[PDB]
């Protein structure tokens, strides 16, 4: 399971550029919420 | 990328809850009973037993 | 304000400029001019007592349609302010009553 | 029958408090939540703040917190001042009841509900003036 788990993902997306620094807010709530929503808005590389 | 694309989640629409699994108590009781009906088996006669 | 006219005997629908998001639960006020406002439709679907059958409330189908309130037979005594109390698990606590459509009627006698 | 019957001074200078007070009858004061409503000439009906049964004043974040609102069941009238009293407040000052309605879109259990708050029987209102005259 756990070989056949990794080949599935090989040829899957790699998200390496993703974690930049991410300015995450919480999302449009009232109080009570507990959090466990980040609304996160970062730069990323586009094809370009 | 070039066409590698990082499916992110959008607005979620509609109303703000948080998940949840559902039982029947009914039959959860009932199914730990009967597992302490045979869990006291293997400790003693009649033991307390604590979940 | 939000002008609007509409002629007699003909049927109208109310609606506010917020949105939605989320669950709703819109209350309708119709607040006559010197006169005190009157709650008319309120939890999406339910009338108080001693209000005419004229107006009918917008349910709740977890999305889409706004606060419609529809005016069924629109009378001489319906130009007033009406207002939009809408309230939704978004938004928190809606501590303003938003613009009032101010509807008025026009071609009457 | 219950009738919400306001009664102020009318008239009142810059930088002054506006007492109002507003009468209850035909009902009693411990059945539903109490509030005030102001509508400035050309504005819409703006909300002030409400008060419960447990005589804890809530007020509307749009005011900056210059308003103290309160009740006296011996009396049994719903009192209202404000403090640093502009101009602009020159409106007229309706009285209302409060519907606490529960309305629940999740579960009970995990706080996932709210209430919405409705404004069923009100009042005639009286109107107050703010400015320089005497
Ligand atoms: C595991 O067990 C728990 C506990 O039983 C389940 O919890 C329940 O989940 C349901 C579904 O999420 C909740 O439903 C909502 O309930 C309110 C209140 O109505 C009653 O509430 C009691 C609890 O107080 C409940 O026992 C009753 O069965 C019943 O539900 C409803 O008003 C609400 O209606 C709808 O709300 C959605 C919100 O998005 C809305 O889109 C939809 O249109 C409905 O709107 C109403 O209101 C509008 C006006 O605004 C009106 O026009 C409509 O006609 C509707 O009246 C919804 O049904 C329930 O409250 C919750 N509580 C409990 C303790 O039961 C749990 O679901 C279950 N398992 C899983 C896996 O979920
Ligand atoms: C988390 O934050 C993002 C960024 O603020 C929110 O997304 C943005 O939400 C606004 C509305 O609040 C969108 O604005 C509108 O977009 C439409 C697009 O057609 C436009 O016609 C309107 O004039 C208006 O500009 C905005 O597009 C949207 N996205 C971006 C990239 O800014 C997001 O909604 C927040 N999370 C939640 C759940 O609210
Ligand atoms: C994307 O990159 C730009 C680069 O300028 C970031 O912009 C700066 O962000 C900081 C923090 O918010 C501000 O203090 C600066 O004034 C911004 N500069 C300019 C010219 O706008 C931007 O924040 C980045 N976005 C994210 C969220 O990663
Ligand atoms: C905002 O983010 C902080 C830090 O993650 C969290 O403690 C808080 O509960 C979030 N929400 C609110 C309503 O402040
Ligand atoms: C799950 O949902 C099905 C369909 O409503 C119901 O028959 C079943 O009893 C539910 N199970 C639990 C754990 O509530
Ligand atoms: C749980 O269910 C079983 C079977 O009905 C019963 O024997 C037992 O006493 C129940 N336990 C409790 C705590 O109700």
């Known amino acids: 399971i756990i070989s056949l788990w990794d080949q599935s993902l090989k040829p899957c997306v790699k998200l390496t550029p993703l974690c930049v620094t991410l300015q995450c807010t919480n999302v449009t709530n009232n109080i009570t919420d507990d959090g466990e929503l980040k609304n996160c808005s970062f730069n990323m590389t586009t094809e370009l | 990328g070039p066409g590698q694309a990082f499916y992110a989640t959008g607005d979620i629409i509609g109303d703000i809850r948080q998940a949840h699994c559902n039982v029947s108590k009914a039959t959860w009781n009932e199914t730990l009973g009967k597992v302490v009906k045979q869990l006291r088996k293997h400790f003693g006669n009649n033991t307390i037993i604590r979940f | 304000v939000r002008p609007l006219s509409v002629a007699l005997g003909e049927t109208a629908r109310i609606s506010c400029g917020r949105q939605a998001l989320g669950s709703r639960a819109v209350q309708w006020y119709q607040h006559r001019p010197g006169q005190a406002p009157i709650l008319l439709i309120y939890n999406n679907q339910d009338r108080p007592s001693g209000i005419p059958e004229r107006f009918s409330g917008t349910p709740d189908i977890n999305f889409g349609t706004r606060a419609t309130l529809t005016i069924s037979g629109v009378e001489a005594g319906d130009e007033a302010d009406y207002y939009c109390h809408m309230w939704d698990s978004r938004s928190g606590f809606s501590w303003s009553f938003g613009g009032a459509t101010r509807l008025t009627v026009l071609g009457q006698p | 029958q219950v009738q919400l019957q306001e009664s102020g001074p009318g008239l009142v200078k810059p930088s002054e408090t506006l007492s109002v007070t507003c009468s209850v009858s035909?009902?009693?004061?411990?059945?539903?939540?109490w509030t005030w409503i102001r509508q400035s000439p050309g504005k819409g009906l703006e909300w002030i703040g409400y008060?419960?049964?447990?005589?804890?004043?809530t007020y509307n974040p749009s005011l900056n917190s210059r308003v103290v609102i309160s009740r006296d069941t011996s009396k049994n009238q719903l009192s209202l001042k404000l403090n640093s009293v502009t101009p602009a407040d020159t409106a007229v000052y309706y009285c209302?009841?409060?519907?606490?309605?529960?309305?629940?879109?999740?579960?009970?259990?995990?706080?996932?509900?709210?209430?919405?708050?409705?404004?069923?029987?009100w009042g005639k209102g009286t109107t107050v003036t703010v400015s320089s005259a005497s």
């Open positions: 209302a009841t409060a519907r606490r309605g529960q309305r629940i879109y999740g579960v009970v259990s995990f706080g996932e509900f709210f209430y919405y708050y409705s404004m069923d029987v």
């Open positions: 008060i419960s049964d447990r005589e804890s004043a």
């Open positions: 035909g009902d009693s004061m411990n059945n539903y939540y």
